[PDB]
Design a protein around this nucleic acid. Structure first.
Ligand SMILES: Nc1ccn([C@@H]2O[C@H](COP(=O)(O)OP(=O)(O)OP(=O)(O)O)[C@@H](O)[C@H]2O)c(=O)n1
Ligand SMILES: [Mg+2]
Length: 437
RNA sequence: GGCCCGGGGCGGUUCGAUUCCGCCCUGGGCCAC
């Protein structure tokens, strides 16, 4: 049951079976045919072109090569039109760099425009160095595509796969680059156990040096960090995962963990056992793309957390959840209620000028001296986290993310108790509190 | 959109703010494929 045995069973979970390969090829063929009628230059990139896509995740990436001189606007317009006329059913919903998604003979496809250059330098559009990533990988990943699939499947099952902002994990390309560096999934896992937050992995130079932050230099452009969007905590989760896997290998590390339900009744008893203040800020989900939403939910969530900590409610952790129509910012504090009074540090008895200005203030209790300096009893405007959040969110909505803020401005409410466990956030609450089972 | 570095105007809070909470101008990088 040692590693190598597990890796064999694992291959079954990550390698596409002959039937799925068929579908992808036929779609590839058809897709080329359609493209070969309109003329137009194109290059298949990504995991389908390199035969490193994960089982049950077949998505063909076609990149339309345009002349450098063309305007950004021409790019989207032509790409849009070409995308639409080439797909059975389509859908446009770019985030910054436009592109068209669709289905050809049942397979997902991504038609993306990009400028055609020589030398991946002075990139015109944000995705220009992608075709060069394909060239560089072409002759070096050949024969290790299965090692790539194991790594992707590992990260996928543990929730740190993608590099979109929702995940802030490992991109596919990053994965491929790691296979070319260490040679296999097993070696990557073995070495990643010793990675640090200053680790720099440079495949073009076959080197590993210590830097200012986790960096995986792009062979194509040594100034771009391929793991730029990999968050620190997620880097940390992978390293820990690699350690655990080596100690007690298991096919489980490649199988997705089910949301694993819990009765909102068990959740209520846990919160009571904990004795904390658990609540959420609910508002309507802005109609924007994931890559726009999450960073905003992240800011909002953080801005409120910081409010809760400087206000002494002792926040434990924060979380957030986006559903079809609403969003939720979750919080947990050790302080369900604080006194109305508190002490505010004053000047040292020494300089009377400021002592006066300090005592000149209208106060309900009369300041005192303690260890050489004046202190005053002040009165809070709120005494619970919810009251505090309600206030802050009503007045500081503009700093809670462009769209998330404007939405909280037109409406939001604070949910807690039984009425909160009925919302679709139980998974996030359990993960946030470390509930196990 | 978010994050990092920088210039310049303000508001609030404070005994006391460049130094905490925010707002308006604006320059330069990075990420998302
Ligand atoms: N953060 C990212 C995302 C994408 N890419 C470029 O876009 C390709 C990845 O496109 P994507 O479709 O997001 O993933 P795949 O690489 O195709 O792999 P998989 O579909 O299995 O996730 C990479 O090879 C690379 O050229 C990149 O450089 N950095
Ligand atoms: Mg793909």
């Amino acid at each position: 049951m040692k590693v190598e045995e597990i890796l064999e069973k694992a291959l079954e979970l990550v390698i596409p079976d002959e039937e799925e390969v068929r579908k992808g090829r036929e779609a590839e063929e058809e897709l080329r045919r359609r493209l070969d009628e309109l003329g137009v230059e194109y290059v298949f990139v990504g995991s389908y072109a390199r035969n490193t896509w994960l089982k049950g995740s077949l998505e063909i990436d076609v990149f339309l090569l345009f002349p450098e001189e063309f305007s950004k606007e021409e790019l989207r317009e032509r790409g849009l039109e070409i995308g639409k006329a080439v797909l059975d059913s389509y859908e446009i919903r770019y985030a910054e760099h436009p592109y068209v998604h669709g289905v050809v003979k049942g397979v997902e496809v991504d038609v993306v425009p990009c400028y055609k250059l020589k030398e991946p330098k002075n990139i015109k559009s944000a995705v220009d160095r992608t075709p060069f990533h394909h060239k560089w990988l072409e002759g070096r990943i050949k024969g290790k595509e299965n090692e790539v699939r194991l790594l992707k499947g590992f990260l996928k099952a543990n929730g740190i796969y993608g590099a979109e902002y929702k995940v802030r994990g490992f991109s596919g390309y990053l994965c491929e680059l790691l296979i070319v560096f260490y040679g296999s999934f097993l070696e990557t896992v073995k070495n990643a156990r010793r990675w640090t937050r200053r680790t720099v992995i440079d495949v073009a130079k076959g080197e590993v040096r210590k830097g200012e932050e986790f960096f995986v230099v792009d062979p194509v452009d040594e100034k771009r960090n391929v793991a730029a969007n990999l968050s620190l905590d997620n880097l940390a989760r992978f390293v820990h995962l690699c350690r655990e896997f080596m100690e007690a290998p298991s096919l489980g590390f490649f199988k997705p963990k089910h949301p694993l339900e819990i009765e909102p009744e068990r959740l209520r008893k846990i919160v009571e056992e904990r004795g904390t203040a658990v609540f959420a800020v609910k508002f309507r989900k802005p109609d924007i793309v994931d890559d726009n939403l999450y960073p905003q939910l992240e800011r909002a969530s953080r801005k409120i957390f910081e409010f809760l900590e400087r206000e002494n409610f002792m926040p434990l952790r924060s979380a957030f959840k986006a559903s079809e129509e609403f969003c939720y910012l979750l919080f947990e504090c050790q302080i369900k209620e604080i006194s109305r009074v508190f002490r505010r540090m004053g000047p040292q008895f020494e300089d009377e000028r400021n002592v006066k200005k300090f005592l000149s203030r209208n106060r309900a209790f009369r300041p005192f001296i303690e260890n050489g300096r004046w202190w005053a009893f002040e009165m809070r405007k709120f005494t619970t986290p919810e009251e505090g959040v309600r206030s802050y969110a009503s007045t500081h909505w503009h700093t809670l993310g462009k769209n998330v803020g404007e939405s909280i401005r037109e409406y939001f409410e604070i949910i807690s108790g039984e009425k909160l466990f009925k919302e679709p956030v139980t998974a996030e609450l359990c993960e946030m509190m470390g509930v196990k089972d």
